[PDB]
Amino acid sequence: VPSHRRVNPPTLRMKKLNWQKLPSNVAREHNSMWASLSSPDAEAVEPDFSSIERLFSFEPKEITFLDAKKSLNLNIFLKQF
Amino acid sequence: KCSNEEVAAMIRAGDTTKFDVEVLKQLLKLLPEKHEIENLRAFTEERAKLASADHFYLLLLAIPCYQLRIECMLLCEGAAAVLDMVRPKAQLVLAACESLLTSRQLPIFCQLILRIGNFLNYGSHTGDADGFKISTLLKLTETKSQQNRVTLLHHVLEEAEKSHPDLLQLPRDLEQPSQAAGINLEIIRSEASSNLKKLLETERKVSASVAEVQEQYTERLQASISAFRALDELFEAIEQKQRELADYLCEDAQQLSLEDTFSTMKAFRDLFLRALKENKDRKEQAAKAER
Amino acid sequence: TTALVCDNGSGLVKAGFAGDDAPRAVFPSIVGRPRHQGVMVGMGQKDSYVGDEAQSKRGILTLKYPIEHGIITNWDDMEKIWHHTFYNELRVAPEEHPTLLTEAPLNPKANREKMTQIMFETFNVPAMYVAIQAVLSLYASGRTTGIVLDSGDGVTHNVPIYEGYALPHAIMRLDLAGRDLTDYLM
Amino acid sequence: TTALVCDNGSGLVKAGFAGDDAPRAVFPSIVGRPRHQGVMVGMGQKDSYVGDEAQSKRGILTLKYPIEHGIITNWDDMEKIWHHTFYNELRVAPEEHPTLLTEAPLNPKANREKMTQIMFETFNVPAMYVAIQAVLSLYASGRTTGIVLDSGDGVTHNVPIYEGYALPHAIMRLDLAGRDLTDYLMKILTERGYSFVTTAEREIVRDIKEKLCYVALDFENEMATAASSSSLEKSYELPDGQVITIGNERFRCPETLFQPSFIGMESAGIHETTYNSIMKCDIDIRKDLYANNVMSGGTTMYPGIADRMQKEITALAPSTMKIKIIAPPERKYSVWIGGSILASLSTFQQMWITKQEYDEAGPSIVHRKCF
Numbered sequence: 001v002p003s004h005r006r007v008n009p010p011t012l013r014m015k016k017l018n019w020q021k022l023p024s025n026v027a028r029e030h031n032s033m034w035a036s037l038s039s040p041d042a043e044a045v046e047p048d049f050s051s052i053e054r055l056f057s058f059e060p061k062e063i064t065f066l067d068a069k070k071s072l073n074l075n076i077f078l079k080q081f
Numbered sequence: 082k083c084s085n086e087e088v089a090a091m092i093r094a095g096d097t098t099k100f101d102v103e104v105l106k107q108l109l110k111l112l113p114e115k116h117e118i119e120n121l122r123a124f125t126e127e128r129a130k131l132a133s134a135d136h137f138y139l140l141l142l143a144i145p146c147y148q149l150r151i152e153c154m155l156l157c158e159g160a161a162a163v164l165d166m167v168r169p170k171a172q173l174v175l176a177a178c179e180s181l182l183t184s185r186q187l188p189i190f191c192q193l194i195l196r197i198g199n200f201l202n203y204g205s206h207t208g209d210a211d212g213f214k215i216s217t218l219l220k221l222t223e224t225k226s227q228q229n230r231v232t233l234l235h236h237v238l239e240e241a242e243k244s245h246p247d248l249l250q251l252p253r254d255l256e257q258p259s260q261a262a263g264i265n266l267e268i269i270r271s272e273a274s275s276n277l278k279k280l281l282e283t284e285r286k287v288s289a290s291v292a293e294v295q296e297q298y299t300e301r302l303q304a305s306i307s308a309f310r311a312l313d314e315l316f317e318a319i320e321q322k323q324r325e326l327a328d329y330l331c332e333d334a335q336q337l338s339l340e341d342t343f344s345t346m347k348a349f350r351d352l353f354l355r356a357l358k359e360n361k362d363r364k365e366q367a368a369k370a371e372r
Numbered sequence: 373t374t375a376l377v378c379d380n381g382s383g384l385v386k387a388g389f390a391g392d393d394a395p396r397a398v399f400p401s402i403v404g405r406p407r408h409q410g411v412m413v414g415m416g417q418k419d420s421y422v423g424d425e426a427q428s429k430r431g432i433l434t435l436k437y438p439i440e441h442g443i444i445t446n447w448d449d450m451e452k453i454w455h456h457t458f459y460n461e462l463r464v465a466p467e468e469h470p471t472l473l474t475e476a477p478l479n480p481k482a483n484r485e486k487m488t489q490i491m492f493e494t495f496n497v498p499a500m501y502v503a504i505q506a507v508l509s510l511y512a513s514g515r516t517t518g519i520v521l522d523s524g525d526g527v528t529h530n531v532p533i534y535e536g537y538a539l540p541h542a543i544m545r546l547d548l549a550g551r552d553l554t555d556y557l558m
Numbered sequence: 559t560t561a562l563v564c565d566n567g568s569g570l571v572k573a574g575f576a577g578d579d580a581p582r583a584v585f586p587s588i589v590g591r592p593r594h595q596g597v598m599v600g601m602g603q604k605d606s607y608v609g610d611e612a613q614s615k616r617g618i619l620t621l622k623y624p625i626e627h628g629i630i631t632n633w634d635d636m637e638k639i640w641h642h643t644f645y646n647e648l649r650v651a652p653e654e655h656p657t658l659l660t661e662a663p664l665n666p667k668a669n670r671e672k673m674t675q676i677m678f679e680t681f682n683v684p685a686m687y688v689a690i691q692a693v694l695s696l697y698a699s700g701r702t703t704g705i706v707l708d709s710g711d712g713v714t715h716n717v718p719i720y721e722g723y724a725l726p727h728a729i730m731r732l733d734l735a736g737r738d739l740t741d742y743l744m745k746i747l748t749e750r751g752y753s754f755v756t757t758a759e760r761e762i763v764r765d766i767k768e769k770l771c772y773v774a775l776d777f778e779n780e781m782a783t784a785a786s787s788s789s790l791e792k793s794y795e796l797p798d799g800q801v802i803t804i805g806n807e808r809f810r811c812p813e814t815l816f817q818p819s820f821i822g823m824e825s826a827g828i829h830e831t832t833y834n835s836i837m838k839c840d841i842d843i844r845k846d847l848y849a850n851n852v853m854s855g856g857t858t859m860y861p862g863i864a865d866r867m868q869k870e871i872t873a874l875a876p877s878t879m880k881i882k883i884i885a886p887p888e889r890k891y892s893v894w895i896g897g898s899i900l901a902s903l904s905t906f907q908q909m910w911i912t913k914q915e916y917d918e919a920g921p922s923i924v925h926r927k928c929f
């Protein structure tokens with residue numbers, strides 16, 4: 001029934017926002033921030049979920065077991081012989 | 082750069098222009114000792130034969146209640162310095178709490194952040210929540226996109242530029258909340274309480290002193306005690322607004338709900354301006370690349 | 373593809389292909405403009421001789437060096453040098469070949485800016501890189517560390533290099549090289 | 559009898575009569591030798607120009623600094639400096655006037671031996687005194703206690719003094735001052751295409767540093783402002799008539815004082831030197847040093863150094879107590895002013911070093927007499 005809880009589900013898997021969840025009874029208190037926002041008369045901005053889905057979703061090859069720097073030094077070392 | 086008689090008469094006259102905190106601290110650290118005072122009082126010869134140091138000490142001994150007068154100089158300049166450093170900061174703290182308790186675009190902004198967080202964490206235990214703590218605004222920059230360039234806060238201020246730009250007027254309400262306190266309020270509160278106790282002791286000593294010291298210094302002592310009582314009333318108002326801010330953000334008052342909220346909110350407003358700046362730089366660099 | 377190395381030195385430009393041990397096109401960096409009066413009709417004679425052509429016919433030419441103390445003075449002359457070494461000596465299209473450039477230490481940065489602008493606009497390349505000459509001199513020796521005293525034609529500079537990392541603050545420069553020795557011998 | 563105060567600093571020798579406010583003879587400490595050939599026979603072509611003559615005719619002179627990193631290296635040049643500052647500048651006999659002198663902290667003892675032997679054998683005086691520069695700077699600040707960051711031309715040393723007791727263990731020294739800033743400014747001007755390689759050009763770059771450079775309050779904001787807009791660019795006229803214009807080099811050059819990794823030194827800035835000097839003191843007296851951060855030396859003449867210094871200490875120190883920076887406008891000559899304060903005192907007659915003390919105890923009584 002609140003406006004913010006009306007969430008369309010994402011098709012792709014979204015990256016998780018990490019926060020500590022407030023309990024719903026505490027946030028709906030009369031002195032709280034969120035009692036004014038659970039009313040439908042407040043201005044609830046619609047997020048663009050398509051953009052969030054777009055941005056926040058999840059020769060032969062010389063195979064070497066070494067990093068590029070040590071291979072570079074070894075090649076510079078070997079070609080002087 | 083003057084004689085012993087002029088600084089002696091300036092100490093007696095109550096003039097504080099050439100007497101700041103450090104000079105009076107040196108003078109109190111170069112107070113005469115008991116045997117020095119007794120030897121100068123038992124000095125019976127010609128006082129021109131003494132040094133200028135001993136002549137200055139005899140001029141200092143000639144001043145009645147001279148140590149109490151020097152204490153009055155030091156406490157007046159110290160009380161003035163303490164009020165000048167503490168009172169605009171305490172006024173900024175009171176204005177910070179007053180504009181934190183009431184805000185216009187901040188419910189719309191935190192409702193939008195709650196909608197986006199409910200979209201991101203849908204199906205989890207944290208999702209379908211009616212709210213969050215004030216520390217989530219620090220944690221807005223933690224969540225960050227595929228390209229590792231745009232954070233969640235940067236994305237929110239990017240979309241808020243085109244949709245609802247009144248959120249860009251959000252730091253205008255938070256400028257008296259901005260810059261926090263700078264220092265801990267309890268330490269300068271203890272300094273103000275110690276200064277008020279010292280000034281009350283000094284007024285009791287002046288009331289025990291002669292009428293010359295009373296007419297010279299009692300009105301300054303009364304003005305300083307009145308200003309420090311107004312400062313203590315301001316501290317009590319800050320305590321009341323601290324309890325109001327603790328009940329406003331749904332946190333218990335036993336934890337630090339005064340300075341931590343100022344630091345969290347100051348860092349969040351700096352991240353707001355920094356995210357605005359980086360999104361403007363991203364838009365300008367994209368425009369330059371397009372050109 | 374096969375990369376190019378073009379050491380654009382202060383007195384001689386040494387260009388050639390990567391993977392090779394001998395530079396294919398070694399030619400001096402001069403621009404020879406005629407100064408006397410031509411009397412032949414038939415054209416043929418250019419208004420600017422570049423490279424070995426200016427060396428061969430040098431008795432009727434004013435020779436201008438575009439690079440002075442590791443700093444490109446006349447950019448049009450150095451563009452002509454680059455055009456000659458790309459199109460006449462080595463004869464390669466610049467937009468299909470990687471090309472490695474060299475630069476002296478402690479240079480003015482706008483010289484590097486203008487070389488980057490010419491190599492990405494005029495002779496636009498698929499890729500390029502600008503690197504310190506003493507580092508490449510140490511890489512020729514087969515060793516990773518050491519000090520290189522590179523004394524070219526405009527700049528004599530000392531660079532110490534530890535583990536492939538050239539130490540920036542200890543690099544020094546001296547504007548005394550082969551052109552000044554030539555002037556003193558003159 | 560009027561005494562003489564003569565700070566023989568690394569940068570400029572500042573001398574004058576005691577009991578006064580300003581030094582009469584301020585001149586740089588250089589010895590200039592001609593490197594070319596003389597052809598014009600006559601007119602007093604003297605082989606070694608000293609001081610202002612070496613400054614004026616500097617285009618044909620190799621200039622040598624006798625004091626390098628606060629240490630008198632060349633001694634004959636320093637004798638020529640003393641001869642010029644006594645005979646030509648002040649024009650006074652040394653044998654009828656006391657002469658106060660100054661010295662750097664943690665100095666070698668044989669340096670003090672040699673200065674005492676020159677001040678009693680060559681330039682004979684009735685009396686003389688050697689004092690620490692930070693102590694005289696604190697005296698000219700009018701306070702007995704405080705911490706002094708003295709940054710000259712070679713040495714930036716931190717000295718805390720509590721109630722006249724200069725704490726020896728807490729004194730430290732960082733070899734980064736004005737000549738290093740001048741050499742770095744020579745290095746970074748070559749990015750703009752201006753070459754300054756000679757010692758004559760060092761005075762021109764030093765004048766650029768004196769006239770145009772300033773300490774940034776925030777370095778990264780000044781990078782952003784300099785890269786964004788060319789509003790902070792400033793033009794300077796060379797002695798040959800050419801005009802250069804410098805941008806970020808006005809504040810990249812003093813930033814070596816806060817970031818010595820620019821010239822490649824592992825030690826941190828002067829703020830960390832001040833703070834690590836403060837933890838070497840007793841915890842009772844640290845509160846007084848926080849409110850009494852005195853500066854001296856001309857490397858502190860940049861007009862943004864106080865607020866940046868207070869910001870750096872307030873970032874470093876705990877914010878529970880008060881931080882204050884003592885930066886008087888005449889802190890360039892505060893070494894000389896403190897010497898003039900100390901010379902004309904009635905008590906200071908009994909701490910003079912006489913010739914009889916010299917004859918009895920060698921040139922070595924300065925160790926047991928002074929701190």
Ligand SMILES: Nc1ncnc2c1ncn2[C@@H]1O[C@H](COP(=O)(O)OP(=O)(O)O)[C@@H](O)[C@H]1O
Pocket residue numbers: 379380381382383384385523524525526527550551
């Ligand atoms: N065999 C040689 N003997 C002496 N000097 C030479 C010789 N070969 C070249 N040089 C000097 O070196 C200069 C070329 O040096 P070079 O390695 O091309 O420097 P850069 O690459 O910086 O131009 C020439 O001007 C010449 O004076």
Ligand SMILES: Nc1ncnc2c1ncn2[C@@H]1O[C@H](COP(=O)(O)OP(=O)(O)O)[C@@H](O)[C@H]1O
Pocket residue numbers: 566567568569570571709710711712736737764767768769854855856857858859860890
């Ligand atoms: N107005 C100024 N602005 C910036 N730097 C200055 C200024 N005046 C002097 N300096 C620098 O500070 C030094 C001043 O010398 P000083 O500290 O009096 O003695 P010394 O450095 O020789 O011990 C000079 O070397 C000069 O480079």
Ligand SMILES: [Mg+2]
Pocket residue numbers: 381382505523524525
């Ligand atoms: Mg070369």
Ligand SMILES: [Mg+2]
Pocket residue numbers: 565566567568569570710711855
């Ligand atoms: Mg000095």
